[PDB]
Design a protein around this nucleic acid. Structure first.
Ligand code: ATP
Ligand code: MG
Lengths: 154, 544, 485
DNA sequence: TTTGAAAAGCAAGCATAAAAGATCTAAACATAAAATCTGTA
DNA sequence: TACAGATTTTATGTTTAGATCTTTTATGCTTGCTTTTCAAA
């Protein structure tokens, strides 16, 4: 589920229900994490991947109501006798396990480019050019998208 | 953790009378049951009459408001001492809708909101009594065309001493514009608790001239002629008569505490009387013998503490200088007619003499102390009954187990404590609160709050917190701190911090910062600057 | 039931609330959407502005020039055209999703170039060498709400009409989940991109994040006014998704502007018309009259416009204004009405370039009454004396009174003082303000010459000059009475 | 009984805390048309 | 299947409670010179 493309952060439980319950069966109206917590008791491990969960804070209000959704999601993925895991991707003891994806180096960028172009029969690039582009794209915060734009523009 | 929440519900896991065993744990459980039951009959008998008195207060006040309301200008009523809780009711009079519109300072941020709430209440009442409209004064203009009836509006301005006076002035000038309509009459009720002149000098003089055309005044407050206090205390005297007598010091305690409260002194009187009755039925074991059928339940402890009376002291000293259970059980029949005499002189005082501005509690106090004649030598109309109304109290024997007296200082700790004085005295003389039983450290060093307060009390305007911390260090002993900090080998971090050569100063700084922010939370100390945190100001002084 | 307030003018559109994710029961249940009768584009107002022409209008010798120089009718943009066309053609032919960022100053041909690119792409798709696509045009300044773009784009894709939130999850479902074989390529022109910038920046993220989806087949061509917009207003996610490649449209040089104007003046310049001398109507091939607009005039206008903005709109409007000045002089000379050589000279071009430069503010202050000039003179005197940019109105009153009472021996002051303080009348007492004091104060406030703060005490209220001090000084010492003293 | 001298007092200077309010914004409170659900006929 | 009615969705208006920032004014420390009341000759 991509969190930004939802109209409100309060309906995501419903969309989780709208991702899981079949259309032929009854369609209950999920208001909060209590209804989803009731829904997941008779079960089969439920995996959700929330992309941009950082946009699950509220830009208004203050500290209290800004965390209103992420804390109720964290409680739902930590209470016993459910099978609801929560993978959250955001941009830069019940606390979630933290994995920090690192910015790529030049050699990692070179290996990704060679692996993506290995399906092609003939490489139209000299490898030194890919190395030069990768080392110019390997700054303090260098991303693979910039390398793709640079090569495509080449 | 529940300690880090704002609010949480706990249902405790469960696996009948709050009265305890007296006479050093030798009172029988049946006496505990009789004390509980008999306290409940006395308490219920008091509060039934208190409830009837309270409903009489509201009924008579509603009657006089309705009298003053119905017998081209406002009809203005100034209710002095209002402390507004009255539910004013109006007539069900045909061909004219009577609407009561109540306004508070919370409902009055400006004139527009006052008019909008007034017209919404007017339309709601006129729809409930029998298309949408604009909530402005033109609804008053077209009232006969929409409902066929005349309009009588009564405005109840609740807590006028809190409302903005410019807004109230402009609302009254706005309401003046409805005087050009023949079907409208307007009444205004102002609930005042300060004075008439206070509101007279916060309104413009044209509005004062407007209100002067038709205005009446009426006193509302609970100390109006004392007759509502005088009932309630007499109701207590109708409850305790023949059972216990009141002490004179308890009655003058009542007088002083009711003289300190303006708006609500009736409920304070009821609270003090109730707490005295609770204290009596919780403390004395002789309150079973208030019921005259328990006189066979005497034991050795009852007679052993019965003989320790000053009245029994004086009686047996007189009988020894002249020349027990049966002597006790026969002397419980006298009625102590001071209450009946007080009621008799009250009904004589407003029966024919027309003296009604008296306090019955003052009369009962002067009757208790024997200075009744000095009390009724003030009115100069009852000179002819200095022997008709004369009474001499009789000091009966062992009445000090059957009494309501204020000498232990319990009422002035539970109902009106010296709060901040108690806080600073427990801070400064802590040995008083804490038992005098870390064996070698508790005898030598005070608790850190008490030592810090004793260094705090002896300081100036501005305390330099570093030098104050040095003054806190020099009171502490280094040797037994270093000895006691090594008395737990399980925690090795404490031992390796104790091995450091700057251990004592560091530990003293831990205790000093903890105690300083304890005082900052309690309000004793203040950082005058938001940043820096290098100086403090004292806030509170002992004994003020 | 009695309402506390009423809403009696609510107009709600017939928009459904159920999004596209719940139309069919499965991903496999979705048909090929290119065959649906409502999807992918599968006006009634044009006849409302028709009338009956019962007259015959006269089109003169300069009428065709003015009609032809309009913005409604691609020489200098061929590298930008090639870049946009090649990126979009590669994105269409490979079934890819691509963002093309184009930025520039007003009137440099951004919208024209993107529209010419999509016309050649549709013509290329009509010859069956690239797959067919749907072209959507979304202008952010033509929306009432910024979320209405969600309303617009989905209505262009499906033909349904939904509310903006349901349209947003409909577009998300369509771009991510529906496979390529059941879809059609969509090319979206987002024009005035800054107008679609909100505090949440959700529209920006959604529109540029759909171009990162594998199944989307979406080409977003975003037109900006600056190149540093994603760094200044947008976050790092949206800046990363927009990309490093960014096409800048520079302002036109004067060669390019001259080529544009000469391209619009091909077939009319150095040509002959048949002109009626009775009415004035002229026909392109009774007198045979040759029409010219000189190349030196066009090059002067092109150089001026290229140095100021490089704007094709301004170059065309300056040429049209010069032709209208010439045509007005022509109708004045020959007495023509609105029913051998005629030239748009260089002098008309200089007049058109100078009419937006002539500084009417000084002329306006020169043509004011004596009381308004006296007010401005007193205010300037106070700024000279105490050196402050804001002066209290009571100080202006006192220094006007001092200026009247010190230079009394001037004959104009002896003529004007009774008018100023009594309106030339006995039985009118002497006035604390001058006559028309509030009138000239409000008049100078209406023009923007003055700023007045919002205070209720009229004496301590401050007044500041909003115009430059030197132009007020030259307007004041143009006046013969005020420069005398 | 004096004496004088350190404590108290007064005014200028100036950095700074704070009162007042201008401007705004979130949150409770409130209404409403179109769409969607829902329980039977 | 369909339909009358109840509920939801989306959309906007009304009123109160509080935050933030700006401008002007009280205030609190510093420094230098003047009075003055109580611990010793
Ligand atoms: N290369 C060109 N050749 C011919 N006419 C041009 C050219 N560039 C611009 N014009 C003229 O200028 C008009 C305005 O240009 P266009 O609408 O493309 O500007 P823009 O750069 O998108 O400006 P804005 O930022 O104001 O939207 C065009 O409609 C056309 O009449
Ligand atoms: Mg454009």
């Amino acid at each position: 589920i991509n969190c930004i493309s939802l109209g409100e952060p309060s309906s995501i439980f419903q969309k989780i229900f709208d991702s899981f319950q079949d259309l032929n069966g009854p369609t209950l109206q999920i208001k909060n994490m209590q209804h989803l917590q009731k829904f997941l008791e008779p079960y089969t491990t439920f995996v959700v991947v929330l992309d941009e969960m950082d946009r699950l804070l509220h830009a208004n209000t203050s500290e209290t109501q800004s965390v209103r959704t992420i804390l109720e999601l964290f409680l739902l993925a930590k209470l016993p006798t459910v099978s609801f895991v929560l993978i959250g991707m955001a941009n830069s003891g019940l606390l979630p396990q933290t994995i920090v994806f690192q910015p790529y180096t030049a050699e990692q960028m070179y290996e990704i480019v060679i692996q993506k172009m290995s399906s092609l029969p003939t490489i139209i690039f000299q490898p030194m050019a890919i190395k030069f582009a990768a080392k110019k794209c390997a700054g303090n915060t260098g991303d693979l998208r910039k390398l793709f734009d640079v090569l495509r523009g080449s | 953790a529940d300690a880090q929440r704002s609010h949480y519900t706990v249902y405790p896991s469960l696996p009948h009378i709050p009265f305890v065993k007296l006479l050093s744990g030798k009172e029988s459980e049946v006496n505990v049951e009789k004390r509980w039951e008999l306290y409940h009959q006395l308490h219920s008998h008091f509060h039934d009459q208190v409830d009837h008195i309270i409903d009489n207060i509201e009924a008579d006040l509603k009657a006089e408001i309705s009298d003053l309301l119905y017998s081209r200008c406002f009809n203005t009523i100034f209710l002095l001492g209002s402390d507004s809780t009255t539910k004013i009711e109006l007539k069900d009079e045909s061909s004219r809708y009577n609407v009561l519109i109540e306004l508070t300072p919370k409902e009055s941020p400006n004139v527009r909101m006052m008019l909008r709430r007034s017209m919404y209440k007017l339309y709601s009442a006129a729809d409930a009594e029998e298309n949408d409209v604009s909530y402005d004064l033109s609804l008053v203009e077209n009232f006969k065309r929409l409902f066929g009836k005349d309009l009588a509006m009564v405005f109840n301005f609740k807590d006028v001493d809190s409302i903005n006076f410019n807004t109230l002035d402009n609302f009254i000038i706005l309401l003046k514009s409805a005087f050009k309509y023949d079907h409208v009459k307007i009444s205004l009720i102002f609930n005042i608790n300060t004075n008439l002149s206070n509101i007279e000098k916060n309104l413009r003089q044209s509005t004062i001239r407007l209100l002067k055309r038709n205005y009446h005044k009426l006193d509302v407050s609970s100390n109006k002629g004392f007759k509502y206090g005088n009932q309630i205390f007499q109701s207590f005297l109708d409850t305790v008569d023949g059972k216990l007598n009141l002490s004179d010091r308890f009655v003058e305690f009542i007088l002083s505490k009711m003289a300190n409260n303006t708006n609500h002194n009736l409920q304070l009187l009821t609270k003090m009387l109730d707490y005295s009755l609770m204290s009596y039925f919780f403390q004395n074991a002789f309150s079973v013998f208030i019921d005259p059928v328990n006189v066979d339940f005497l034991n050795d402890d009852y007679l052993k503490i019965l003989s320790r009376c000053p009245t029994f002291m004086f009686f047996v000293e007189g009988l020894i200088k002249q020349h027990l259970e049966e002597f006790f059980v026969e002397f419980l029949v006298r009625e102590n007619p001071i209450n009946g005499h007080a009621k008799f002189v009250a009904r004589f005082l407003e029966e024919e003499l027309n003296i009604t501005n008296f306090n019955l509690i003052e009369l009962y106090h002067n009757l208790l102390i024997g200075k009744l004649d000095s009390y009724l030598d003030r009115w100069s109309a009852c000179k002819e009954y200095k022997d008709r109304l004369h009474f001499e109290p009789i000091d009966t024997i062992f009445q000090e187990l059957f009494t309501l007296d204020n000498r232990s200082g319990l009422l002035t700790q539970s109902i009106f404590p010296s709060y901040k004085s108690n806080i600073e005295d427990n801070l400064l003389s802590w040995e008083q609160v804490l038992p005098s039983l870390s064996g070698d450290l508790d005898k030598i060093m005070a608790p850190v709050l008490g030592q810090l307060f004793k260094l705090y009390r002896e300081a100036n305007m501005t305390i330099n917190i570093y030098d104050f911390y040095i003054a806190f260090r020099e009171t502490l002993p280094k040797e037994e701190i270093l000895n006691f900090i090594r008395k737990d080998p399980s925690n090795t971090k404490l031992l390796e911090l104790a091995e450091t050569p700057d251990a004592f100063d560091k530990v003293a700084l831990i205790l000093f910062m903890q105690a300083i922010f304890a005082f900052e939370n309690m309000g004793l100390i203040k950082f005058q600057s938001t940043k820096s945190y290098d100086l403090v100001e004292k806030c509170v002084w002992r004994g003020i | 039931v009695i309402r506390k307030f009423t809403k009696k003018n609510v107009a709600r559109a017939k928009k459904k609330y159920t999004p596209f994710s719940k139309r069919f029961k499965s991903i496999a249940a979705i048909p090929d959407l290119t065959s649906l009768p409502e999807f992918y584009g599968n006006s009634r107002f044009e006849n409302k502005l028709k009338t009956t022409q019962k007259h015959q209008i006269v089109e003169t010798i300069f009428s065709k020039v003015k009609k032809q120089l309009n913005s409604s009718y691609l020489p200098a943009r061929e590298n930008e055209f090639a870049s946009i066309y090649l990126s979009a053609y590669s994105a269409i032919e490979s079934d890819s999703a691509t963002t093309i960022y184009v930025a520039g100053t007003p009137g440099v041909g951004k919208t024209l170039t993107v529209r010419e690119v999509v016309k050649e792409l549709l013509s290329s798709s009509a010859q069956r060498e690239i797959p067919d696509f749907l072209y959507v045009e979304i202008n952010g300044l033509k929306m009432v709400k910024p979320t209405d773009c969600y309303e617009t784009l989905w209505n262009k894709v499906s033909g349904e009409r939904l509310t903006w939130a349901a349209s947003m999850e409909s577009l998300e479902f369509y771009f991510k989940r529906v496979p390529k074989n059941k879809k059609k390529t969509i090319v979206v022109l987002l024009d005035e991109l800054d107008a679609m910038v909100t505090k949440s920046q959700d529209i920006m993220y959604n529109f540029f994040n759909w171009t990162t989806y594998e199944n989307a087949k979406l080409i977003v061509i975003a037109v900006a006014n600056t190149m540093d917009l994603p760094e200044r207003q947008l976050g790092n996610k949206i800046t990363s998704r927009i990309g490093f490649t960014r096409i800048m449209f520079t302002g036109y040089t004067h060669e390019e502007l001259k080529n544009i104007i000469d391209l619009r003046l091909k077939g009319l310049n150095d040509s002959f018309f048949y002109v009626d001398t009775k009415t004035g109507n002229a026909i392109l091939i009774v007198r045979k009259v040759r029409l010219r607009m000189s190349a030196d005039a066009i090059e002067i206008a092109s150089r001026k416009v290229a140095s100021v903005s490089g704007d094709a709109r301004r170059a065309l409007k300056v040429c049209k204004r010069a032709a209208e000045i010439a045509e007005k002089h022509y109708m004045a000379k020959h007495g023509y009405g609105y029913d051998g050589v005629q030239t748009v000279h260089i002098t008309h071009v200089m007049k058109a370039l100078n009419e937006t430069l002539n500084s009417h503010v000084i002329t306006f202050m020169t043509r004011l009454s004596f009381t308004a000039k006296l007010f401005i003179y007193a205010l300037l005197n106070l700024m000279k004396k105490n050196g402050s940019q804001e002066q209290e109105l009571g100080d202006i009153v006192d220094e006007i009174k001092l200026l009247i009472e010190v230079n009394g021996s001037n004959k104009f002051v002896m003529e004007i003082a009774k008018t100023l303080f009594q309106q030339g009348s006995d039985n009118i007492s002497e006035q604390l303000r001058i006559i028309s004091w509030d009138f000239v104060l409000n008049q100078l406030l209406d023009a923007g010459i003055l700023f007045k703060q919002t205070m209720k005490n009229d004496r301590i209220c401050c007044v500041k000059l909003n115009i430059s001090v030197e132009e007020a000084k030259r307007a004041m010492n143009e006046d013969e009475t005020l420069r005398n003293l």
